[PDB]
């Protein structure tokens, strides 16, 4: 149902962007940057700083290959969503 829908949206959106520079399971820093700028626009303001996209990726980048794996993306999403849930206590 709704959670599945949300989930397959996350999977799909990630997958296609990850196809551009990466390999479906992993967003390269270009793709992570673009994804954040393009899609996370309300939650994070735009990110010109190729340094910072690399930093926030590097922070989670278990593979150390200048990408972030779907796992790391989900981990990032978890804390971001939790912050938004804390917000949502007082919509």
């Amino acid at each position: 149902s709704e959670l599945e829908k949300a989930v397959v949206a996350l999977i799909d959106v990630f997958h296609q962007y990850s196809g551009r520079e990466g390999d479906k399971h992993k967003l390269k820093k270009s793709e992570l940057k673009e994804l954040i700028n393009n899609e996370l626009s309300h939650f994070l303001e735009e990110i010109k700083e190729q340094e910072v996209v690399d930093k926030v990726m590097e922070t989670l980048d278990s593979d150390g290959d200048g990408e972030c794996d779907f796992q790391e993306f989900m981990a990032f999403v978890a804390m971001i969503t939790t912050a938004c849930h804390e917000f949502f206590e007082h919509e």
Partner: peptide, 26 residues
């Protein structure tokens, strides 16, 4: 001695401010 050499400043703040704001409600 402590010059402003640290170009590697917390530029992250520029964006993460919104996250901090959302955490703020707790």
């Amino acid at each position: 001695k402590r010059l402003r050499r640290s170009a590697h400043a917390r530029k992250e703040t520029e964006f993460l401010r919104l996250k901090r704001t959302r955490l703020g409600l707790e």
